[PDB]
Amino acid sequence: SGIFRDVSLLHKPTTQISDFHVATRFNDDFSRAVLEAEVQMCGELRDYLRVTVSLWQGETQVASGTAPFGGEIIDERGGYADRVTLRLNVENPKLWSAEIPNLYRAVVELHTADGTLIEAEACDVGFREVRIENGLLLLNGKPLLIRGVNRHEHHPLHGQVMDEQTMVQDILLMKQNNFNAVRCSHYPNHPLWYTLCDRYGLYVVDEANIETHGMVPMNRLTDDPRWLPAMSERVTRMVQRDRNHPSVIIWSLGNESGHGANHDALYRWIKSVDPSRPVQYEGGGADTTATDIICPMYARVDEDQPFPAVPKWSIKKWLSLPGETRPLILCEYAHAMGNSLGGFAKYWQAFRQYPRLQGGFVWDWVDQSLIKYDENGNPWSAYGGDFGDTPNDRQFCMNGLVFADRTPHPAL
Amino acid sequence: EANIETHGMVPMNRLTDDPRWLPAMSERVTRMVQRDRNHPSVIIWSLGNESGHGANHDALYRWIKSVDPSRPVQYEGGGADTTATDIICPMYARVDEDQPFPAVPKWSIKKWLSLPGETRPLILCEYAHAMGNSLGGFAKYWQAFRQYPRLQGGFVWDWVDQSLIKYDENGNPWSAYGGDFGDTPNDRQFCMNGLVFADRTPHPAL
Ligand code: NA
Ligand code: NA
Ligand code: NA
Ligand code: NA
């Protein structure tokens, strides 16, 4: 517990930019793109107010647009007077991907008709299209093979305080070991993480901070309408914060909370607000109506695990169950506890053989061990129960491919 | 099965893609359906064997579906998963190993079930070629059949050896195969693929 992330003061003018969304559309062969910029303002509307959106590729301006406020007619009552939608045409855009993370810079200016700048905001823009077609997850028209890993925010000395240097070290190691994707383990991450993933080229699964593993029967809260407001806040605020990051390709509704009607509601909400990213969720059997991707946890390659209500089929069998057409991406597989990762080659043979097996995220990146000191002051790595902590789960906090100080294990 | 097989054509569908041969093929299909449609034991119609894939096959598939909608229609021709079959019916597709031939690949049956857009059941029209001392790996097929709901089994090739009886100078009979009658270019012992001998004595593989 504590104030474990940054604290800051922000000063804005009374007439201000309150929100802006960016969206990219493409033609069939990705030769033509249209940058969609919707800007919302707060304060008093004046006729002299204008909004300018300019797209910069490194140092040269490639597109720009200016408009007064006032959107298109929405319904019988009219349109949004405090919103403006800018459309920019880009010829032969450079596409963003983990292999080649081409980025543009978008600058949004709120200014007067005479040319006086009031306030500016900016974001990095990546041109990429994620969609599921005919049972395959496609990025820029090509089917992805996910070489992913689950990553907690953990530092052996500072606990759950994250800093830029540790994040950069993690990204470098992951890329050097042929990972191209990361799953934010069961909560939204530090804001700089998505910027770094944009710049260095990693695909990101962004997860809402919802996990009710300890309930019996695990959906007691997520099937209760009285808890719908809190869950909705946790989902909608994450989507509002992170929707402009090109590295975020998939939304996740949480982790290990069963399956409740609240999950279906929030899945539909995300699909309505942000249709440019697929939504996944593992809870309640990994193939429910609240997921676009079959995302089992620790499903085996060839052996079935028939649990009563939530069976873990083998992934090959899972693909061909009657009526099933979705792609399969394991959200957790190859538990890396200690001396582990036996049978990894079988998973990757399966991934390469089957088109609809599009990979998975290993559990997990880094051990969650903490540093203690002996009577001589020599540090040593501690796990559950070493602090006298109330009922604990001993060494199950260390499942990483690297040590807490980022030294590789042999399984890496 | 209708009495249509053009295995020896190059390409295999040279006749079945030709409208001039449509009347003959149509006779062979429609007369069989007219003769046998009342038998309860007949559960599936088949359009023939090893004739490629031609438009004539699509036409006759639709004709059968119109006249007798109470039985599914299958056909292995070119690919085993074309538009002229209700059932994926490959020939000698293996359990776990793919066989990537250029135009008509033989995927492993498990992989075949999950190819994008594929929803049909899979029943092998021929598998476990029982030539001589054979049927190794049969248990793998049956493990697969029991594990996967959409793998609904198959037909072994085949029941009885096609050997003929000849007699020596002493008059003692002996079993003969392909080239033993002086016949024009032959395929030797490939006529004997049965689980039982020609006189219906079981082989060990049975
Ligand atoms: Na694959
Ligand atoms: Na653990
Ligand atoms: Na079966
Ligand atoms: Na034969």
Curated annotation (Swiss-Prot), chain A:
Coiled coil: none
Site (Transition state stabilizer) location in chain: H152, H186
Amino-acid positions noted as binding Na(+) in the UniProt annotation, renumbered to this chain: F396, N399
Record: residues binding Mg(2+) 1: E211, H213, E256
Phenotype upon changing H335 to E/F/N: Poorly reactive with galactosyl substrates. Less stable to heat than wild-type
Binding site for substrate: E256, E332, Y333, A334, H335, N399
Residues annotated as catalytic: E256 (proton donor), E332 (nucleophile)
Induction per the UniProt record: By allolactose.
Residues binding Mg(2+) 2: N392
Subunit structure: Homotetramer.
Family from the record: Belongs to the glycosyl hydrolase 2 family.
Protein name: Beta-galactosidase
Organism of origin: Escherichia coli (strain K12)
Gene that encodes it: lacZ
Parent-protein start and end of this portion: 207 to 618 of 1024
Curated annotation (Swiss-Prot), chain B:
Annotated substrate binding sites: E50, E126, Y127, A128, H129, N193
Regulation: induction: By allolactose.
Binding site for Mg(2+) 2: N186
Effect of E50H: Slowly inactivates galactosidase activity by reducing the binding of magnesium. It increases binding specificity
Residues annotated for Mg(2+) 1 binding in this entry: E5, H7, E50
Top-level taxon in the UniProt lineage: Bacteria
Active site per UniProt: E50, E126
Resulting phenotype, E126Q: 10000-fold decrease in the beta-galactosidase activity
Binding residues for Na(+): F190, N193
Subunit structure: Homotetramer.
Family (UniProt): Belongs to the glycosyl hydrolase 2 family.
Protein name: Beta-galactosidase
Species in which this protein is naturally found: Escherichia coli (strain K12)
Residues of the full protein shown: 413 to 618 of 1024
